[PDB]
Design a protein that fits this description.
The complex is a heterodimer. Chain A is mainly β. Chain A contains no helices and 19 strands. Classes of the chains: A mainly beta, B mainly beta. The PDB classes it as immune system.
């Protein structure tokens, strides 16, 4: 009993994307296949279902005319094709299988797929620009110092930030990335350390952006002001 | 039907009873409701099917009930793994969701401010970071003031999840400006307001 889906894809605005969902561990034709997307931070949004036997689907009125749900009974794989992709179509697209019900109410989704990340953007891949959040008198409050790194203007997700090659983990907060008006993500990672160790211990943030194959190490040197 | 859930932020300590709500007003009484639990990076997991029937593999602490339009999902005792978002479903409609959060004593944020780095100023972009460290609850109002003038639309903010140790929140607030606009003002500050308290950390551009 499993539901495997296609890998994550990135599409330009106005393009189309097709997502697969192969079924295992059960009879594919005995249950409907529903598609529900979830925007980042939003709730669940039902899109439509499709009958494996006949192939006649039913779409929500929001997606009507833009979604085409097909299936292949030979490989037990269902497909969802969304066209005219907009900037707000960036969401995780799941496939859910309703269970057999005593009252024949086939809407209790007990089996789910891991989801497919579909990102719609008009941006090109760019390496992160890492700037230092230098500790100073504006970040030293009673023996505690604050410092960090600003990971700005990178695309696409994700990035991984560590400190001292993973040796420093206590009091480290890496914020979730925010999508800027330029279409590039930007986050920042911070850490609080004793102000006595600013002049002796060295602190380096390690930003890794595998999509661009760029690995930036930045040394945060304390200021004197 | 239209499904509404409340409260969307139910902060409770571990080990006590949690009660959730789901209102299916735009329906008849279709006792065909369902309950789900979703954790970050994971797909929703079915908990309750029908009005009160427990799904297979769901522990006894989860239970549901309903009367016409008002439905409740109740957890008798809150386990550490029960702090997540919950959704209710009737046919194809989904509620806005309810987030169960660990309740802790009120903590004031540690407000730090970072001027734009000299390296970043060379590229024509200036970013000022306001840091709120280990506070509670998640509610907080951060306002940017440049030369005692409130800013609007030129800042973004992100919040970390509850820390695994102290169950606190950290909030970042970045003010993005150009080099030309940054050079024409001296005083920069962010005003953090939380529960009749307004801490304002400031700096001057030069110096």
């Amino acid at each position: 009993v499993q539901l495997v889906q296609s890998g994550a894809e990135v599409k330009q605005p106005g393009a189309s994307v097709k997502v697969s969902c192969k079924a295992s561990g059960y009879t594919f034709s005995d249950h409907f296949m529903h598609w529900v997307r979830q925007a980042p931070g939003q709730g669940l949004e039902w899109m439509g279902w499709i009958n494996p036997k006949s192939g006649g689907p039913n779409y929500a009125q929001k997606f009507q005319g833009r979604v085409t749900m097909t299936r292949d009974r030979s490989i037990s794989t269902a497909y969802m094709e969304l066209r005219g992709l907009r900037s707000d179509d960036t969401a995780i697209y799941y496939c859910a299988r309703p269970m057999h019900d005593y009252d024949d109410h086939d809407w209790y989704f007990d089996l789910w797929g891991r989801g497919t990340l579909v990102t719609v953007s008009s941006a090109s891949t760019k390496g992160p620009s890492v700037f230092p959040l230098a500790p100073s008198s504006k970040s030293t409050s009673g023996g505690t110092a604050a410092l960090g790194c600003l990971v700005k203007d990178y695309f696409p997700e994700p990035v991984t930030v560590s400190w001292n090659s993973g040796a420093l983990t206590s009091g480290v907060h890496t914020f979730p990335a925010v999508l800027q008006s330029s279409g590039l993500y930007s986050l920042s990672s911070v850490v609080t350390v004793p102000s006595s160790s600013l002049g002796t211990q060295t602190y380096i943030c390690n930003v890794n952006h595998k999509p661009s194959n760029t690995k930036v190490d930045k040394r945060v040197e304390p200021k004197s002001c | 039907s239209v499904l509404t859930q409340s409260p969307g932020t139910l902060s409770l300590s571990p080990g006590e009873r949690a009660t959730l709500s789901c209102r299916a007003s735009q329906t008849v009484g279709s006792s065909y409701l369902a309950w789900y639990q979703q954790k970050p990076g994971q797909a929703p997991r079915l908990l309750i099917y029908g009005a009160s029937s427990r799904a297979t593999g769901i522990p006894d602490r989860f239970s549901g009930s309903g009367s016409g339009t008002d439905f409740t999902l109740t957890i008798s005792r809150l386990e550490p793994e029960d702090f997540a978002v919950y959704y209710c479903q009737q046919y194809e409609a989904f509620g806005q969701g309810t987030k169960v959060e660990i309740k802790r004593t009120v903590a004031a944020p540690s407000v730090f401010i970072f001027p734009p780095s000299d390296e970043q100023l060379k590229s024509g972009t200036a970013s000022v970071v306001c840091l709120l460290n280990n506070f509670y609850p998640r509610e907080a109002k951060v306002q940017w003031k440049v030369d005692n003038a409130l800013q609007s639309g030129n800042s973004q903010e992100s919040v970390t999840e509850q820390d695994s140790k102290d169950s606190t929140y950290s909030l970042s607030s970045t003010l993005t400006l150009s080099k030309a606009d940054y050079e024409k003002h001296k005083v920069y500050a962010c005003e953090v307001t939380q529960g009749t308290t307004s801490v304002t950390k400031s700096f001057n551009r030069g110096e």
